[PDB]
């Protein structure tokens, strides 16, 4: 009941990135995505893995298939990238992604 | 860097105001032991803040009379009191006044004019005074000043003696009358001397030694002997004598201290079956919940570490590491299946469908509510799962409502058939194998217990250490305690027999509760300590004899008598002199 | 909307830190509070959830501080007492607003509380 993320993803502006949340054995169709800016409280991007809390960019999407839950960003901005987290739901305590620092090139 | 040196005999002081004469008089009183190290200082190119400890020795070698000051206390924050002492132009000037202190408080010396050193009014020791609870006013040489705080009393003693040694504390004995007592009431954990700046001095620390004084006819302490210094001086405290004449005196005893401890509790300590609660194949539904007794056993939470675990874990009463640290009484882990959102609805003070109707828990319940998805299993089409959608009150604590009775909406009796607003109150959850996170059933479990106050049924796993042998240890086995040397023993204990014992009715063998084996026990050591001496008239050399031990736990000669330390076995055999034991007669000569 | 934490706590290892999560901007009794630990340069780590109406402590054990989450309903402030402190507990402790029911979301949090657990004094 522990979930797996890719530690890093580097992409370019406008290009599509997908960061995976890979949970061991069973998974729960709810998941929660978090963008942690450096030295700042992570902020929930995606709720029940299908939903954004209000005000969050339309480029921020989430999903899951099998045991994986994706953090999918379309058309990045160099303002956008940050450390990304997914939170396990149920199965006793919510096991947060190891974190993924997103880099955006082209600067 | 502190340059130590050898206290020798200094630091004895009239412990009281009593007079005596020619009378060796034991006393047990904080002193500076003999031959201890003293932390020696200088004045060159030197007055750090030191611990006050219990008390302090002190000295200085003054041809120049420079070391004039003392500042004691704890914080030294000017808020508490601090002693101050200044010895200037023969006029002693003393204060407990409160004031705040310099980086380097001191007195000044402007070298060599009409006023030698001048700078009496240097007086940068400190900021300024604040509150005053007292006042008083008044290498050749040596000033020895003992300071100690007991019962509102700081206390001083002193001697002013001529010497000539540049290096160190002269070796010779004189002891310290009191000058003063100050009924101040400060607490003092630290202190600092103070100086006249343009000279050695020392520090000891007082310890609760017991000395043997010797007063003289005039009543002046002319000598002393530390008891604990060394065997010959453990004797002289026995006899109350300085002369110790030939033969074997028995001073003291020696009990080998235990290694650590051994706690040992029967392996497995049985078990508490939360699985057949949690991993039970067919749960009773939420609407009728299991209540399952678990007893004489040990908090089993170590099965609950490895699994997909539980969509939530909430157990109310006490810390989850008091699961396994704290025993419980009436333990009912409640086996049932609830719909997903209904974990809220299982909790004290819940308004809700589960709570108010089919599964209701107390406000006083100490224990669990735990969720996990059974959509992965319990889902089908299963309409056997059911719930009480409506009921006319809340269930009493841990009570269930089994009613298949008609829910009667109007005063028109339904009489066991359906009609206008004729309801069967219980209803079912259709489980749709496409169920989502809101629609998934959660099997949910609840541990009933009192907390404490009734016997341990589910207990905590109790920590059983490992086992050590041939080595003195404290121990506990199964609540049997004692302290011994646990060895390997052929003592064939009976299958159900726990202890052994012995004619004297003293625990002897035991059997290791976990792994079943016959351990002896054995007392620790004892032995007296006898001090063989040729009369002090001849030597100061003593040979201790540890009676009745094997020579480890202590030029050592193991005897039939005991472990003899400090004498030289001799194949030759001469007439008996200081008979020891078993035919072993010590004697002094080459 | 507002979760304000007690400032950084520097302890010796083995000592105790208790940290206040002060609610404002919403209803305290209608929301559990998640307590989230981020070890410096390390991932998000969730120590437990609490209930406003009750003793709703769950504890992810893993690192064990004998922790208990106490919520002060008058001041709407959930405390996290983290005892048996270790140099690895050194981290930024977030408290996170949780739903009062199963949907576990932390939308809004405290500001985080660094705790430096060391024999090194400040
Ligand atoms: C001795 O003086 C000190 C002032 O420094 C006091 O000692 C402190 O006492 C508190 C207890 O409330 C301890 O927690 C501190 O650690 C102590 N400080 C030190 C440096 O040890 C104490 O109040 C005084 N003793 C008496 C009997 O008054
Ligand atoms: C004094 O201290 C020195 C270390 O500087 C140590 O070698 C010596 O044994 C000490 N003497 C006594 C009597 O403790
Ligand atoms: C010594 O110092 C004290 C400080 O209070 C001062 O009052 C006094 O005049 C000085 N001189 C003598 C001789 O005491
Ligand atoms: C006591 O002091 C007097 C002073 O002269 C001296 O005659 C006498 O011998 C002293 N006796 C002792 C035991 O100190
Ligand atoms: C305790 O565990 C050890 C493990 O090897 C086993 O040999 C021993 O028999 C066990 N004893 C009991 C009473 O469970
Ligand atoms: C239940 O069975 C699972 C097997 O998947 C196991 O991991 C877990 O420890 C068991 N727990 C209980 C309480 O039976
Ligand atoms: C023992 O020494 C004392 C002095 O300490 C002396 O008076 C006595 O004569 C000595 N004993 C013998 C037998 O010489
Ligand atoms: C003394 O102790 C040694 C261990 O150093 C042991 O081998 C020997 O049997 C013991 N003998 C006696 C007489 O105690
Ligand atoms: C006595 O003589 C024997 C040799 O036969 C030797 O082994 C032993 O060490 C001698 N005794 C002492 C105390 O040296």
Author numbering:
A (entry chain D): 2 to 108
B (entry chain A): 25 to 69, 80 to 172, 186 to 245, 263 to 444, 447 to 620, 641 to 676
C (entry chain E): 2 to 123
What sentences appear in the manuscript?
Cellular entry is achieved by the homotrimeric S mediated virus-receptor engagement through the receptor binding domain (RBD) followed by virus-host membrane fusion. The S1 subunit binds the host cell receptor, while the S2 subunit mediates fusion of the viral membrane with the host cell membrane. Hinge-like movements of the RBD give rise to two distinct conformational states referred to as the “close” and “open”, where close corresponds to the receptor-inaccessible state and open corresponds to the receptor-accessible state, which is supposed to be metastable. We reported a potent therapeutic antibody H014, which can cross-neutralize SARS-CoV-2 and SARS-CoV infections by blocking attachment of the virus to the host cell.
Cryo-EM characterization of the stabilized SARS-CoV-2 S ectodomain in complex with the H014 Fab fragment revealed that the complex adopts three distinct conformational states, corresponding to one RBD open + two RBDs closed (state 1), two RBDs open + one RBD closed (state 2) and all three open RBDs (state 3). Similar to the RBM, the H014 epitope is only accessible in the open state, indicative of a role akin to the RBM – involving dynamic interferences in interactions with host cells. Ambiguously, the special conformational transition observed in our complex structures results from the engagement of H014 or a synergistic movement of the SD1 and RBD. As expected, binding of H014 completely blocked the attachment of ACE2 to trimeric S. Moreover, ACE2 could be displaced from trimeric S and replaced by H014. Superimposition of the structure of the H014-SARS-CoV-2 trimeric S complex over the ACE2-SARS-CoV-2 RBD complex structure revealed clashes between the ACE2 and H014, arising out of an overlap of the regions belonging to the binding sites located at the apical helix (η4) of the RBD. Thus, the ability of H014 to prevent SARS-CoV-2 from attaching to host cells can be attributed to steric clashes with ACE2.
